């Protein structure tokens, strides 16, 4: 509350560390469904169904341009990528399996880096 603060957590390396995690996600072999925005002209249903499209390239550009105020807003967009993928894709599809795998991979790096 006013003039009453918990001790200051060092957040000065967060930007660098999120960039590193994002590099690791970009270079994973199962990243291909997520590298670029879904083509809303070429994929029926996507525009109407997925209210907030997100992809790794869009996260990389937001990250690079100071559009994440803190590491939680960064994790929210990463998780959005996988939540969208589960919304639109069966679990027993290549893309559906890719998304589960990538979510697992991300969540471990997140825990190991920050928790």
Coordinates of C-alpha atoms in Angstrom, one line a residue:
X1 CA 0.0 0.0 0.0
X2 CA 1.0 3.7 0.1
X3 CA 4.7 4.0 1.3
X4 CA 4.6 0.1 2.1
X5 CA 6.5 -2.0 -0.4
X6 CA 7.7 -5.6 -0.6
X7 CA 11.4 -5.8 -1.3
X8 CA 12.4 -4.9 -5.0
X9 CA 12.8 -8.1 -7.2
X10 CA 15.5 -7.5 -9.8
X11 CA 13.7 -7.3 -13.2
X12 CA 16.6 -5.8 -15.1
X13 CA 17.4 -9.0 -17.0
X14 CA 13.8 -10.0 -17.8
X15 CA 13.9 -8.5 -21.4
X16 CA 17.0 -10.5 -22.2
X17 CA 15.9 -13.6 -20.7
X18 CA 12.4 -13.5 -22.4
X19 CA 14.3 -13.0 -25.7
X20 CA 16.3 -16.1 -25.0
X21 CA 13.3 -18.2 -24.2
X22 CA 11.6 -16.9 -27.4
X23 CA 14.7 -17.8 -29.4
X24 CA 14.6 -21.3 -28.1
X25 CA 10.9 -21.5 -29.0
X26 CA 11.5 -20.1 -32.5
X27 CA 14.2 -22.7 -33.2
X28 CA 12.3 -25.8 -31.9
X29 CA 11.5 -28.2 -34.6
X30 CA 7.8 -28.2 -33.7
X31 CA 7.5 -24.3 -33.9
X32 CA 6.5 -24.3 -37.6
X33 CA 2.7 -23.9 -37.0
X34 CA 3.4 -20.8 -34.8
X35 CA 6.2 -18.9 -36.6
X36 CA 3.9 -16.6 -38.5
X37 CA 0.4 -15.2 -38.3
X38 CA -2.3 -17.6 -39.6
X39 CA -3.4 -16.4 -43.0
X40 CA -6.9 -15.1 -42.3
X41 CA -7.7 -15.0 -46.0
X42 CA -6.7 -18.6 -46.6
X43 CA -7.9 -20.4 -43.5
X44 CA -11.7 -20.7 -43.2
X45 CA -13.2 -20.2 -39.8
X46 CA -10.0 -18.7 -38.2
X47 CA -10.9 -15.0 -38.3
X48 CA -14.4 -15.6 -36.7
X49 CA -13.4 -18.2 -34.2
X50 CA -10.1 -16.9 -32.8
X51 CA -10.7 -13.6 -31.3
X52 CA -7.1 -12.8 -30.5
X53 CA -4.6 -14.3 -33.0
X54 CA -1.0 -14.6 -31.7
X55 CA 2.2 -16.1 -33.2
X56 CA 5.9 -16.0 -32.4
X57 CA 6.8 -13.4 -35.0
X58 CA 4.2 -11.0 -33.5
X59 CA 5.5 -11.7 -30.0
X60 CA 9.1 -11.0 -31.2
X61 CA 8.1 -7.7 -32.7
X62 CA 6.2 -6.6 -29.5
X63 CA 9.2 -7.7 -27.4
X64 CA 11.6 -5.7 -29.6
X65 CA 9.5 -2.5 -29.5
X66 CA 8.8 -2.2 -25.8
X67 CA 5.2 -3.4 -26.0
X68 CA 5.4 -5.8 -23.0
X69 CA 5.2 -3.9 -19.8
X70 CA 6.4 -6.9 -17.7
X71 CA 7.3 -10.6 -18.0
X72 CA 3.6 -11.7 -17.2
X73 CA 2.2 -9.9 -20.2
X74 CA 4.9 -11.7 -22.3
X75 CA 3.8 -15.2 -20.9
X76 CA 0.2 -14.3 -21.5
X77 CA 0.8 -13.9 -25.3
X78 CA 3.0 -17.1 -25.5
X79 CA 0.1 -19.1 -23.7
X80 CA -2.4 -17.4 -26.1
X81 CA -0.5 -19.0 -29.0
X82 CA -1.1 -22.5 -27.5
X83 CA -4.6 -21.8 -26.3
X84 CA -5.6 -20.7 -29.8
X85 CA -4.0 -23.8 -31.2
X86 CA -6.1 -26.0 -28.9
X87 CA -9.2 -24.1 -29.8
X88 CA -8.8 -24.7 -33.5
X89 CA -7.0 -28.0 -33.8
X90 CA -7.7 -31.6 -32.7
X91 CA -5.2 -33.0 -30.1
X92 CA -4.6 -35.9 -32.6
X93 CA -3.3 -33.8 -35.5
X94 CA 0.2 -32.8 -36.2
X95 CA -0.5 -29.2 -35.3
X96 CA -2.5 -30.2 -32.2
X97 CA 0.5 -32.3 -30.9
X98 CA 2.9 -29.5 -31.9
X99 CA 1.1 -27.1 -29.6
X100 CA 1.0 -29.4 -26.6
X101 CA 4.7 -30.1 -27.1
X102 CA 5.6 -26.4 -27.4
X103 CA 3.5 -25.4 -24.4
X104 CA 5.3 -28.0 -22.3
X105 CA 8.7 -26.8 -23.5
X106 CA 7.8 -23.2 -22.8
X107 CA 6.5 -23.9 -19.3
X108 CA 9.6 -25.7 -18.2
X109 CA 11.9 -22.9 -19.5
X110 CA 9.6 -20.4 -17.7
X111 CA 9.8 -22.2 -14.4
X112 CA 13.6 -22.8 -14.7
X113 CA 14.3 -19.2 -15.6
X114 CA 12.1 -17.3 -13.2
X115 CA 10.6 -19.6 -10.4

